[PDB]
Design a protein around this ligand. Sequence first.
Ligand SMILES: *[C@@H]1O[C@H](CO)[C@@H](O)[C@H](O)[C@H]1NC(C)=O
Ligand SMILES: *[C@@H]1O[C@H](CO)[C@@H](O)[C@H](O)[C@H]1NC(C)=O
Ligand SMILES: *[C@@H]1O[C@H](CO)[C@@H](O)[C@H](O)[C@H]1NC(C)=O
Ligand SMILES: *[C@@H]1O[C@H](CO)[C@@H](O)[C@H](O)[C@H]1NC(C)=O
Ligand SMILES: *[C@@H]1O[C@H](CO)[C@@H](O)[C@H](O)[C@H]1NC(C)=O
Ligand SMILES: *[C@@H]1O[C@H](CO)[C@@H](O)[C@H](O)[C@H]1NC(C)=O
Lengths: 99, 148, 238
Amino acid sequence: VVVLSFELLHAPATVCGPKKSTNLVKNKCVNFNFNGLTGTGVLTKSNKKFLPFQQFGRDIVDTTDAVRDPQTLEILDITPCSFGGVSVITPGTNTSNQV
Amino acid sequence: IYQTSNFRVQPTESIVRFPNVTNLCPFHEVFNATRFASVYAWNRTRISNCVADYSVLYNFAPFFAFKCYGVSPTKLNDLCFTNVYADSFVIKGNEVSQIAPGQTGNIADYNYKLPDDFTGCVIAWNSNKLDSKHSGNYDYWYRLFRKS
Amino acid sequence: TQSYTNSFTRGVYYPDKVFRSSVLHLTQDLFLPFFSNVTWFHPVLPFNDGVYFASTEKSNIIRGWIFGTTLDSKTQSLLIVNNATNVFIKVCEFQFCNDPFLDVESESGVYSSANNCTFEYVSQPFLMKNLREFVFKNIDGYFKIYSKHTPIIGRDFPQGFSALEPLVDLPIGINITRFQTLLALTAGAADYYVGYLQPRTFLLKYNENGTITDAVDCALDPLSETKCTLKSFTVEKG
Ligand SMILES: *[C@@H]1O[C@H](CO)[C@@H](O)[C@H](O)[C@H]1NC(C)=O
Ligand SMILES: *[C@@H]1O[C@H](CO)[C@@H](O)[C@H](O)[C@H]1NC(C)=O
Ligand SMILES: *[C@@H]1O[C@H](CO)[C@@H](O)[C@H](O)[C@H]1NC(C)=O
Ligand SMILES: *[C@@H]1O[C@H](CO)[C@@H](O)[C@H](O)[C@H]1NC(C)=O
Ligand SMILES: *[C@@H]1O[C@H](CO)[C@@H](O)[C@H](O)[C@H]1NC(C)=O
Ligand SMILES: *[C@@H]1O[C@H](CO)[C@@H](O)[C@H](O)[C@H]1NC(C)=O
């Protein structure tokens, strides 16, 4: 007979759920979650020079644009998925119905 | 020419990453160690600052009356904690039934009374030949009738 | 001993892990003001919101620091000694001895005994003339030990700019209203300094590689605040 009598004292210790890491994919508009950092984009190869203690990359307007992989220490550049407006060119409906 | 709507490329799949888990708990050897005390002086070492790996607990040696007095065992895998006390002792199955927070009956109130709040979960399985002497293990003692 | 010296431009540390490239970031944080006023040593030093320590001793005497409320076997205390093998950090009470000097081996000389102890951390020794800087921030419950080692030869307090890196943010949170230095064994060569951090606003310059190479205070003089307002290091006529 053995017990596992738990106790949580304010800040939890490193005893936590196992981190169910998955595979890594690139060059695809995908959702992501790097160590709690959410967002969607396209992940490519980077030329950054992160010092051995940073994790993120911040641009001028403070939007994240570079993340280091926690499993293997590699820096990945991110990019938003494509978007834009749509415009329709038509002659008059009195003329035809092609667009 | 008219500006009508917008187009957006849909995400294809999902993904999630985390560092190497590692940081294994040096307390699994408390489980299946025939000299994990007998009744009274349980190993004061506690599960702290490693992993809350409760998955191996259910897939461990076949338990007989494993009773969890805390949250449901399904969610116990991922809930975070700070420290986890482990009490190592051997009793009878009827005493295992007698073991409950704020309950009486032999060891449950005479040898090692379970905590009244008892933020924890007991795991019990049959030992038999593992820690039983051929002539009867007289080295193991229990309080028949404690003062209170 | 109890002298005084200006601090020049020293005591700048990285506020976060975020990587920035060729920008100018304006930040509000606890800093040591430029040209501040420090007390040369050659100790009942209180703790208010964080201290700066920049000893340049050739030996390792002043190593060791005590943090707590009463600094006794009544409230939890700390201990950070960095000898040639491993650095040990305790979070439990220790009845103080008559003097905070190492007997030389590590228990009776500095304190009385160890009892009712808790989380103990170890790591590689901190040590690697040998100007060693520290910033003992204790924001919330994640005690910070920002540090930087510059064994470059200098004066008792030279000039120049160099930033400080983080070490660890251990899970502490006991009351630390008072602190105290330790020494290993008065009129000795105890060349160390103390500087009290203070709320302040700075304008930091990041190089393309991502290291803080310069900074300007925002409350030192009119030119400095003008630079902070324009977010630039150069100002035109006007
Ligand atoms: C995490 O595990 C993988 C699996 O082999 C290993 O290659 C990698 O080096 C590990 N990460 C660290 C930081 O050791
Ligand atoms: C520092 O403080 C001392 C005493 O408080 C004072 O005499 C001195 O003018 C101050 N400034 C400097 C630069 O030493
Ligand atoms: C901490 O200790 C000081 C005295 O050392 C006391 O005045 C204060 O109330 C204590 N608590 C906090 C939260 O500062
Ligand atoms: C460094 O201090 C630790 C703390 O007790 C001690 O065990 C170790 O022997 C010391 N190193 C040397 C070289 O004595
Ligand atoms: C430590 O814990 C023991 C046991 O609860 C208690 O008796 C003691 O007062 C505590 N403090 C010290 C300094 O021993
Ligand atoms: C950053 O990297 C560039 C490219 O190698 C180099 O020229 C520059 O000196 C580096 N800056 C550092 C290491 O501070």
